Amino acid sequence: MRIGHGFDVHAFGGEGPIIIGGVRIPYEKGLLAHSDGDVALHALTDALLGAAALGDIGKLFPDTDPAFKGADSRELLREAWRRIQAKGYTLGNVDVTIIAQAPKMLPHIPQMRVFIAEDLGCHMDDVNVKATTTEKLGFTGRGEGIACEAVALLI
Amino acid sequence: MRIGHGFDVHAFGGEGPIIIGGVRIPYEKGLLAHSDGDVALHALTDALLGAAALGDIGKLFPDTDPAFKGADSRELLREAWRRIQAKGYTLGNVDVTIIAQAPKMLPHIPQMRVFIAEDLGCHMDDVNVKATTTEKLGFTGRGEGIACEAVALLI
Amino acid sequence: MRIGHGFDVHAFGGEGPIIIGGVRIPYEKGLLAHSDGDVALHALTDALLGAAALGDIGKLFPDTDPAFKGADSRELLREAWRRIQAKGYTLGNVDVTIIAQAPKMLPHIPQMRVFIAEDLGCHMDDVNVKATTTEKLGFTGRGEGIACEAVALLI
């Protein structure tokens, strides 16, 4: 068994919606990023790659490479997962923590779990997503962006 | 074995003391929250619920429900633990990291461990709590609030 | 198997270079701290100590004790590791996440892995280090300091 941890942040910019955990969530502002800016899946990806000792998302899918512009972070998740499985690992379970003042993530979590469980080829019970605000404190509390943390356990 | 991760933040407000890890710690200011605002136990709770794929603290004990006003976060911890055990899990070990410029947490950690070990029904050796400041940087460094992170391993 | 988590922050100050994961990295500014201020190894140390239920870095190597001034964080890592092994644990794997806007950590990661794997007496495959920026948001985004998170799995 191997443990992994990921952390990611994206700033708000433009018109909504935002894509979090693969779900299109309505919001006043959108998120700025090379890909679709899915903070949750990026953090999740780093956790899995980390547990596999494969590095991180930027190393495998460079900000510079134009092939990843507007990229579906789920596509990146699946590829990172493919490579991980090739190194010989299987999923243990993953846990994600979205840190945002708004929008409300709770109603979208079930669908996020559905998408992630599909992408990782596992049972929905092997996937957990949660959210918390920083009580108006910080860049997240001031609504400047969304952060996300994740841990993974590979077998 | 399942892994879990939690993160929580509460802003200072009012007169002290603050309750962290169940311990009443003397401080100039107190913490604002629906319950007693125990940042450490909330983060710990999310870690355990996450590892159990039970969601998060807000989902089980809503900010809206007046039954949780002034609530003892230890009561919430035990209940979340009860439910977790019902899903069939046993405690592996937990690790907590309190992020605060002040007050000093170190002298209160032993008692925190005592409380948590009791609430989780485990040996004190299965529980670890630590602290760090962000070196005056950030909302924590500016003394605007306390943050806390936690990881858990269920069996 | 036991899980651990660590988090650390150090503010920029003075002339460079900075020491991260044991590597001397060229930078305009340096990092302020009692020891060499290696944010990555401190976070890693707390993760390992946490998983071992040995507390944290400050508890074992006090900011007050002048013996640790300018200290090589690798020396502190090895000692914490020595004690951990004495409690009976062996390394599972560790994962580190450096949170910095700059400098670029990627090219220095291989050497960091070499140092850490040596200090922990393991294969480089049992060690992973990654980096991410907070997209100009926060004290890290504003270049005020570097943060770092880490998780560890002991056996």
Ligand SMILES: Nc1ccn([C@@H]2O[C@H](COP(=O)(O)O)[C@@H](O)[C@H]2O)c(=O)n1
């Ligand atoms: N300080 C930093 C920040 C990011 N990066 C590299 O850039 C990639 C991701 O960049 P972002 O911060 O834009 O998400 C990561 O692979 C990371 O290693 C780095 O090498 N040093």
Ligand SMILES: Nc1ccn([C@@H]2O[C@H](COP(=O)(O)O)[C@@H](O)[C@H]2O)c(=O)n1
């Ligand atoms: N962006 C956010 C922030 C919090 N929440 C929900 O609110 C509950 C906790 O709220 P607090 O941020 O007040 O601790 C969590 O269960 C979380 O899922 C959310 O759904 N979306």
Ligand SMILES: Nc1ccn([C@@H]2O[C@H](COP(=O)(O)O)[C@@H](O)[C@H]2O)c(=O)n1
């Ligand atoms: N709020 C805080 C912050 C740090 N500390 C103690 O100080 C030591 C490390 O201090 P630094 O924040 O300077 O890294 C840790 O062992 C921690 O327990 C504390 O006891 N309470």
Ligand SMILES: C[C@@]1(CO)OP(=O)(O)OP(=O)(O)OC[C@H]1O
């Ligand atoms: C996902 C990738 C794709 O280029 O980039 P972004 O969408 O900018 O977001 P980031 O988290 O900054 O970096 C990692 C990259 O792999």
Ligand SMILES: C[C@@]1(CO)OP(=O)(O)OP(=O)(O)OC[C@H]1O
């Ligand atoms: C603990 C609960 C209880 O209503 O609320 P709070 O004391 O406000 O703190 P929070 O961490 O914001 O949310 C989760 C809730 O379950």
Ligand SMILES: C[C@@]1(CO)OP(=O)(O)OP(=O)(O)OC[C@H]1O
């Ligand atoms: C590493 C030690 C050594 O005195 O201190 P620092 O170099 O200041 O950094 P910190 O992360 O604040 O605290 C823990 C101490 O053990």
Ligand SMILES: [Zn+2]
């Ligand atoms: Zn990202």
Ligand SMILES: [Zn+2]
């Ligand atoms: Zn809380």
Ligand SMILES: [Zn+2]
């Ligand atoms: Zn430090």
